[PDB]
Design a protein around this nucleic acid. Structure first.
Lengths: 747, 175, 59
RNA sequence: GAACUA
């Protein structure tokens, strides 16, 4: 219309970096720019900003005239510089791509190449390219240039137009559907797919933006919108070819995960001498494997109806398995067996669908995997049974609509004040007055949480959220004394290593059940020394997860495998750690937020996963119970120390697969996903709190969230993730996850 | 960026006929409603959901784009069972902005969802208000959408063709 | 159609897929045909009607 | 939350 020079600069800042990628004609809008490039998009998908002619008179005003940031993206230094140098070179124009990228790289240093390096600079906190553009054919370097330009264009388009899916899809379609040559379209499409995928993974790895939007799901939806828009443009270069490229890239990543090396599968099995076959340039890292098998491929399959070349993919992957490693050049390089990869993919898929749907599409060769992924209920433990059967009766009598904290307090204090271990506990070698109440209220809180979990079964998010908010004053009231404080006065382990007389008295006479994390690591430490810590501090969800038998374990084979845990336990642990811990972390006090209840802390989530990842031998009750517990932990410590010494002696740049592994965090993807989601949620809540009008409750919330982030960093170091072996280096030695967290640049 | 070239301001081509009857407005609701829409609207309407579709499936696809403060599935007033319409409330308005652009036209459960903007969710509109407690769309539809039960209640009623697998939300007080 | 034969349709028999599925199924067929990928010897023998029953695309 | 129009 009549944009001011301020409005003109911003228009130029967002939509002037893209003109070099089409062949700055200058003084032409984007529609006539595309008309001179063969009109890749029809006059239906053209947007209004594409029709805005470039200005007059103002151009000498703008030449005289840092740049504001964007609403929801952690912009890169290269992207900010390139988009700022394009406004400088658009007005000076009132070939072009090469000078633009060369200048942008020079700006960064002073406080093929020149396009591969530009992509790496964008996707960095440098990035190792996941897919190589050298495998195109022979005697044609033009295709490599086109593919590299396409990758850079995809990265910049996701950076700028990413929050509007249709606009980004239209821009990418316009780039791909240029009429330069028939063989150039394939290169552009391959570059665009590769750029979108790699940018999504790098963003989730090393970018903090505080919005709670998953880059991988957005990447998958963008690719499916690209295919749909290709089909609509095809209706009157084919959407089938784009979807073929999208699948080929996904399958190449999948086969690189399975094979463990750059097998160059698509280059070997190839149709003819004129085609582009996607080829990974390196093995995949653990974070990228998690992204693909947990977020990206499940989302893409959901859109495609969970359909896929299932039989062909499974058959080829198992053939990739037989190989012994051809080579292990990359330190952070993961190899997984075919069964493990498809199990992870299908358990991520099974959350968004039903068994029948998956089994209907899945062929008969998946029967073993399907049966392994398809005692599934939450049952009250015997420890909370008779005091929880009253609370459950009350809950059933009223229902989540009628449950009140004030009445629940009286119902709980009546059912947990008449039973043994409670009337036998107020009887009391000598427990202080503080000690006995810090035990009774701990038991009441555990009973309430167990009753809530059993009642809701964590099947509906709405009811779980309602009851957590409603009973949230009561949880805070009961957890105020316990909070972050050891329930017992002193460490239960005293060095022959034995237990304190108070701990033994409680466990063997009053039948008090502590969860095996306040005393097992500190007993492993004593046994190691023969030849308070964050995890010793009370976490209610750790105790509750221990009593429900949520033991998450790795496979006997090794990293090569993955989840060795039972299907029922895995499903229950997912529901727990997603809909009771993470979803309740900073949840609104009231429904219909910037105001949150401190029922779940970040340290609570981390401690619960550390407890769930303990060895099942040490997290199982004997059959004096205390003595059998300790013997068992002594024998396990001896075995694990022997293994650690063997691994250290064998190791003499060192690959992460040769390091000692506890098969706890690197084997269970739920652990890694939960630990990442804790910090992501904390940052997003902090952004929402900051966006709210300033006051006093907002300042209190900000202080609480900063303390939560600091405590999350502390608990991560306390468990060995962030660095004679220690107990933490024997129970939770996870080189891959530790590497990711150290080099992510978020701690 | 593209949010500076496309006006993505929250908008409702829809007008709740029952909040217009009140306030006695001759299509004047937009003049007043737009305020609660541009600022503080984190509620997104979900459409074309199978009575089979469940909140956890709804929660996962929406959770990807933003944390959900409130997840609500519409209940037929007569059956207290899903009408195939859902209300999603986000702690962040940007999360609601993410949900409308990213999820529109996606298959939440093998069907094309239609995410919209809503001024807010109270405990009245959460109940379908058509013929048999469902949505008005159900009565007037002239097609065979089996996942929505089949033919529309009005075409089914006369032609003469007509569950347990549906989730009975009995923790929600009857209207 | 206008057919009065109406019974229970379970849940996996009442799924009708969008028109774009013709593009993606053609893409899967193209990626399997070229690049030399073959199904399992045993999923191929589901020529006696035990193979995946795949949902219908509209129009 | 397709009330035109059933």
């Amino acid at each position: 219309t009549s944009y001011t020079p301020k409005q003109w600069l911003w228009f130029l800042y967002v939509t002037s970096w893209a003109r070099p990628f089409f062949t700055y004609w200058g003084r032409l809008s984007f529609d006539e720019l595309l008309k001179l490039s063969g009109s890749p998009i029809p006059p239906a998908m053209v947007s209004l900003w594409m029709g805005l002619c470039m200005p007059t008179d103002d151009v000498v005003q703008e030449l005289r005239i840092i740049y504001p940031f964007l609403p929801r993206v952690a912009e890169s230094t290269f992207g900010r510089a390139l988009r700022s140098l394009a406004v400088r070179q658009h007005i000076s124009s009132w070939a072009a791509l090469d000078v633009l990228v060369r200048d942008t790289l020079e700006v960064i240093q002073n406080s093929e190449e020149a396009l591969e390096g530009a992509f790496r600079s964008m996707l960095s906190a440098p990035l190792f390219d996941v897919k190589a553009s050298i495998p195109e054919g022979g005697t044609a370097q033009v295709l490599i240039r086109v593919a590299n330009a396409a990758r850079l264009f995809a990265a910049l388009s996701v950076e700028a137009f990413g929050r509007v899916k249709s606009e980004c899809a239209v821009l990418l379609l316009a780039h791909i559907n240029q009429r330069d040559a028939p063989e150039h379209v394939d290169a552009r499409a391959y570059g665009v797919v590769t750029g979108v995928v790699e940018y999504a993974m790098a963003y989730r790895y090393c970018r903090d933006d505080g919005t709670g939007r998953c880059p991988l799901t957005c990447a998958a939806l963008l690719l499916h919108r690209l295919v749909e828009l290709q089909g609509i443009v095809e209706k009157d270069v084919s959407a089938s070819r784009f979807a073929n490229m999208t699948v080929a890239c996904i399958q190449e990543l999948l086969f690189c995960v399975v094979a463990g090396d750059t097998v160059r599968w698509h280059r070997e099995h190839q149709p003819d001498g004129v085609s582009v076959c996607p080829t990974a340039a390196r093995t995949l890292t653990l974070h990228e494997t998690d992204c693909l098998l947990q977020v990206f491929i499940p989302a893409l399959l959901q859109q495609v109806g969970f359909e896929w070349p299932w039989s062909e993919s499974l058959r080829h992957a198992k053939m990739l398995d037989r190989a012994r490693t051809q080579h292990i050049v990359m330190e952070d390089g993961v190899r997984l067996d075919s069964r493990s990869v498809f199990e992870e993919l299908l358990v991520s898929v099974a959350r968004r669908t039903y068994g029948l749907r998956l089994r209907a599409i899945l062929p008969q060769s998946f029967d073993v995997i399907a049966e392994n992924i398809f005692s599934s209920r939450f049952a009250l433990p015997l420890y909370y049974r008779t005091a929880g059967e009253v609370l459950l009766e009350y809950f059933d009598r009223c229902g989540p609509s009628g449950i009140t904290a004030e009445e629940t307090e009286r119902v709980l204090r009546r059912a947990t004040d008449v039973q043994p271990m409670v009337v036998q506990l107020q009887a009391l070698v000598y427990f202080s007055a503080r000690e006995k109440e810090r035990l009774l209220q701990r038991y009441r809180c555990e009973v309430l949480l167990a009753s809530l979990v059993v009642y809701t079964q964590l099947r509906t998010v709405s009811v779980v959220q309602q009851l957590t908010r409603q009973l949230a004053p009561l949880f805070e009231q009961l957890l105020l004394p316990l909070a972050h404080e050891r329930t017992l006065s002193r460490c239960p382990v005293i060095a022959l290593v034995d237990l304190t007389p108070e701990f033994k008295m409680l466990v063997d006479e009053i039948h008090y059940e502590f969860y095996p994390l306040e005393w097992v690591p500190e007993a492993v430490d004593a046994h190691i020394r023969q030849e308070p810590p964050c995890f010793a501090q009370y976490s209610l969800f750790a105790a509750i997860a221990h009593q429900f038998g949520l033991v998450l374990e790795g496979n006997p084979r090794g990293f090569r495998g993955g989840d060795g845990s039972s299907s029922e336990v895995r499903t229950k642990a997912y529901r727990f750690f997603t809909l009771m811990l993470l979803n309740n972390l900073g949840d609104a006090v009231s429904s219909s937020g910037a105001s949150f209840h401190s029922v779940v802390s970040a340290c609570d989530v981390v401690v619960t996963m550390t407890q769930c990842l303990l060895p099942a031998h040490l997290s199982s009750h004997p059959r004096s119970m205390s003595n059998e517990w300790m013997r068992r932990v002594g024998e396990w410590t001896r075995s694990a120390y022997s293994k650690y010494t063997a691994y250290q002696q064998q190791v003499h740049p060192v690959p992460l697969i040769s390091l000692y592994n506890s098969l706890t965090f690197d084997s269970v993807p739920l652990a890694r996903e939960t630990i990442r989601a804790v910090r992501s949620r904390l940052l997003e809540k902090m952004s929402v709190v900051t966006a709210s009008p300033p006051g006093d409750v907002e300042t209190a919330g900000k202080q609480l969230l900063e303390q939560h982030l600091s405590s999350l960093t502390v608990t991560l170091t306390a468990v060995g993730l962030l660095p004679v072996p220690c107990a933490t280096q024997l129970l939770w030695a996870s080189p891959f996850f530790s590497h990711e967290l150290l080099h992510c640049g978020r701690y | 960026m593209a949010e500076y070239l496309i006006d993505l301001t929250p908008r409702m081509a829809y007008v709740d006929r029952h909040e217009l009857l009140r306030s006695l407005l001759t299509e004047k609701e937009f003049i007043e409603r737009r305020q609660e829409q541009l600022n503080k609207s984190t509620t997104v309407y979900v459409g074309n959901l199978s009575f089979y579709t469940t909140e956890d499936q709804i929660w996962e696809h929406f959770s990807r784009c933003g944390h959900i403060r409130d997840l609500v599935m519409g209940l037929s007033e007569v059956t207290r069972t899903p009408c195939g319409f859902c209300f999603v409330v986000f702690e962040s308005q940007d999360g609601a902005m993410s949900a409308v652009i990213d999820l529109h036209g996606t298959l939440l459960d093998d069907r094309v969802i239609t995410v919209s903007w809503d001024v807010g969710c109270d405990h009245t509109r959460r109940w379908g208000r058509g013929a048999h407690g469902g949505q008005v769309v159900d009565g007037v539809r002239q097609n065979l959408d089996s996942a929505r039960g089949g033919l529309g209640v009005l075409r089914r009623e006369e032609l003469g063709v007509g569950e347990d697998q549906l989730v009975h939300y009995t923790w929600i007080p009857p209207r | 159609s206008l057919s009065d034969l109406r019974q229970k349709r379970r849940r996996e028999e009442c799924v009708v897929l969008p028109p774009i599925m013709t593009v993606w199924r053609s893409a899967f067929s193209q990626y399997t045909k070229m690049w030399g990928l073959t199904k399992f010897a045993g999923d191929i023998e589901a020529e006696r009607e035990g193979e995946g029953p795949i949902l219908p695309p509209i129009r």
